[PDB]
Amino acid sequence: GRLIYTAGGYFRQSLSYLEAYNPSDGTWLRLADLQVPRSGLAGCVVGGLLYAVGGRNNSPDGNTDSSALDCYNPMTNQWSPCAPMSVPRNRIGVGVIDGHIYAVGGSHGCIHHNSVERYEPERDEWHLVAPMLTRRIGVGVAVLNRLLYAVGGFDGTNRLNSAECYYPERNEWRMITAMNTIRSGAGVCVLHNCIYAAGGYDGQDQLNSVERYDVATATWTFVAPMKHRRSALGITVHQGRIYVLGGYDGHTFLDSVECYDPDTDTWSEVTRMTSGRSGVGVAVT
Ligand SMILES: CC(=O)N1CCC[C@H]1C(=O)N[C@@H]1COC(=O)c2ccccc2C[S@](=O)C[C@H](C(=O)N(C)C)NC1=O
Ligand SMILES: [Cl-]
């Protein structure tokens, strides 16, 4: 029984919520709140532990970008602080290779990072790796063939359709085929050896379009669009299906959870979050 965890988010301000959805019985679990509210964070799992990486705490009285790394133990229902990153990273992308967390791009105030750093849970240490070829905030990160892909985002001036690839063994980045659509704040994940980029914002509108990268043909192909246009959505893969959680559609903060079936190329609404929010960190354990 694996659960879909949603951490933080934004609605009126940055949120502390930690909730877990059970796709089998359709139930929601209210877990221990994050010690610090955060939106624009990313979640990941290493060794059955959930990690909440970066983000920003938006409050009516002030905002603070986060360099924090926090660890949640499902067995104890406890958050424990870990070593912080070298810099705050709001609107971050995260990816796991060999139980090591890569924190990719994001912003700190006026600064749009191209820097990337890697966390080692065994040492509780962050180390900078080679920076990306492009500054990317609202970046989608996917791990495919033990390579770390950084997909779309925003560079401080322009929203990107470009994508690049990190080779951990060689410690280097290379540009790959650009997507068909410019996407900042999309849901990026890997399903059946493909990278999916669902939703996002193109500089004008929130998107419902979904495209997938096939490594063999090095091409991006459009698949069935989602029912809702959404940017700042949470995304995950559970039992061979894609789940998109919340986001912003240009008018409202969505509580909608859609599920993608690759066999039928269809999306369906599976549940609703307890409240609408955007900028959540999502992971499965
Ligand atoms: C104008 C604006 O963004 N404001 C004004 C001050 C607070 C901030 C706000 O409200 N941010 C939240 C949280 O967003 C995120 O965590 C996030 C995470 C990843 C990528 C991108 C985003 C942005 S999201 O794609 C754009 C969407 C929006 O345009 N409005 C609601 C008007 N904003 C949001 O949901
Ligand atoms: Cl924000």
Residue numbers in the entry: 325 to 609
Paper passage:
The nuclear factor erythroid 2-related factor 2 (Nrf2) upregulates the cellular defense system against oxidative stress by mediating the transcription of enzymes acting as antioxidants or being involved in detoxification. The Neh2-binding pocket of Keap1 is large (550–780 Å2 buried surface area) and contains three arginine residues (R380, R415, and R483) which interact with glutamic and aspartic acid residues in the two Nrf2 motifs that are essential for high-affinity binding.
Oxidation of the sulfur atom to a sulfoxide (compound 2) resulted in a 3-fold increase in potency according to ITC, whereas sulfone 3 and sulfoximine 4 were 20- and 100-fold less potent, respectively. The crystal structure showed an S configuration for the sulfoxide stereocenter of 2. In brief, the phenylene moiety of 2 is wedged between the side chains of A556 and R415 facing toward the KELCH channel, while the C-terminal dimethyl amide is stacked against the side chain of Y572. Just as for 1, a chloride ion bridges Keap1 and the serine NH of 2, while the amide carbonyl group in the macrocyclic ring forms a hydrogen bond with the hydroxyl of S602. The binding of compounds 1, 2, and 39 to Keap1 is enthalpy-driven under the experimental conditions (T = 25 °C) and displays unfavorable entropy components, in particular for 1 and 39.
